[PDB]
Amino acid sequence: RPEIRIAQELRRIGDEFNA
Amino acid sequence: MRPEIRIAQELRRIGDEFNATYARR
Amino acid sequence: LGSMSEEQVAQDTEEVFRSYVFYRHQQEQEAEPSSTMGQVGRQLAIIGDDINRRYDSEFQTMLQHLQPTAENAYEYFTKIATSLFESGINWGRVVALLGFGYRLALHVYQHGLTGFLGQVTRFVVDFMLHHSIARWIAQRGGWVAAL
Amino acid sequence: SEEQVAQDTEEVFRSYVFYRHQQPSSTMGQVGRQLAIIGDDINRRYDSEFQTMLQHLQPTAENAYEYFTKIATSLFESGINWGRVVALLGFGYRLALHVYQHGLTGFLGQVTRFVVDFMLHHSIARWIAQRGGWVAALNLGN
Ligand SMILES: [Br-]
Ligand SMILES: [Br-]
User: Fold this and answer.
1) D82 Cβ contact partners less than 8 Å away, ≥ 6 residues apart
2) Is A1 within 8 Å of chain D by CB?
3) Residues bordering ligand 1, an ion, CB closer than 5 Å
4) Exposure pattern of D48-81 as b/e (b: 16+ CB <10 Å)?
5) Which end of chain D has fewer surrounding CB within 10 Å, N or C?
6) CB distance D127 to C30 below 8 Å
7) Using only C-alpha atoms, what is the Rg of chain B?
């Protein structure tokens, strides 16, 4: 689903930054 | 004046100006 | 067989006004044609753009004092157009009607952006409140911790 | 404690959008300015891919909250950290401008119906119909 693919990327882009 | 009246007064003035030169007889 | 009815003009107005707005916007963009009704919109958009470059500045000011919002825009558009045709109808006044409707639309649209930002702000606030985000931030030292 | 964070969120998010678009006399406004600088950098690398996902999601002003809620819910379901919170603001900013810009044609359609509805009931369409319809407009010259 679009919501899943979108939110799945925000968490990957969020965690990739804070690390 | 109020904007509602001035706007409608100018649209009427501009439209009739257009009509007087581009609405063929 | 038949004649132009009111409804026939109404249905065509949709296609005409769409083409009018499309080419009006296209000319304001650079300044920074299939169906027959689409061409009427293009021809009128060409005329409306000349009338605009001449008389737009004054309407920008008159729209400021009117202060049309998404709520009363229909109300103001109705009584303004009513006074426009009260003393008669001609092609010129019809052209002015399209030019005013286009400008009133874009005006209400542009000035309604801050209103939409407030709604999104409530979405952010609403989410953080009930999804323990505010609890996490308050315990992490508050919003001041971001600095 | 929570309510203090909630109230500040309004001021912070306002300054965030104010400086994001630009690319404020308050302590919360400075937080928004700092976040807007970081959020703009992350937006310069991964924006292209979200443009497509926003195309298929098709968020409108009606269901925007519904979609924003469950999207943000899945974002923090596995935990909360400062990084994910900043991403939430970056998504809210993009979701806002996207729904706003793509709703213009939607707003024009409503305005189109106001004009049509007006011409029907105020004898405007009848007047045009008697002159030959809209095809008659092509005779405006000289
Ligand atoms: Br005025
Ligand atoms: Br007349």
Assistant:
1) A18, C140, C145, C146
2) no
3) B 3, 6; C 62, 65
4) eebeeebeebebeeeebeebbbebbebbbeeebb
5) C
6) no
7) 11
- Contact between residue D8 and residue D28 where contact means Cβ atoms under 8 Å apart: yes
Interface-testing mutation among C121, C126, C130, with chain D (most D C-beta atoms within 10 A): C121
Dist CA C72 CA C112 (whole Å): 12
Q: Residue D40 is encoded by which pair of tokens?
A: 């703009």
User: Helix and strand tally (H, E) in chain B?
Assistant: 1, 0
Report in angstroms the alpha-carbon separations of B14 from B2, C120, D58, D99. Answer: 18, 41, 41, 36
Separation between Cα atoms, residue B18 and residue B11, nearest integer Å: 10
Q: Which CATH architecture has domain C6-146?
A: Orthogonal Bundle (1.10)
Q: How far apart are CA C114 and CA C69, in angstroms?
A: 12
- Angle between helices C6-30 and D104-121 in degrees, nearest 10: 140
Distances (CA, A) of A4 to C31, C126, D74, D83, D94: 42, 21, 8, 19, 17
Contacts of D140 in chain B (CB under 8 A): 22-24
Contact D43, D90 (CB under 8 A): yes
Helices D82-102 and A2-18: crossing angle in degrees, nearest 10, is 140
Domain boundaries D1-139, CATH class: mainly alpha
> Coil, strand or helix: which one is C99?
helix
Q: What is the resolution of this structure in A?
A: 2.8
> How far apart, in whole angstroms, are the C-alpha atoms of residue D95 and residue C120?
9
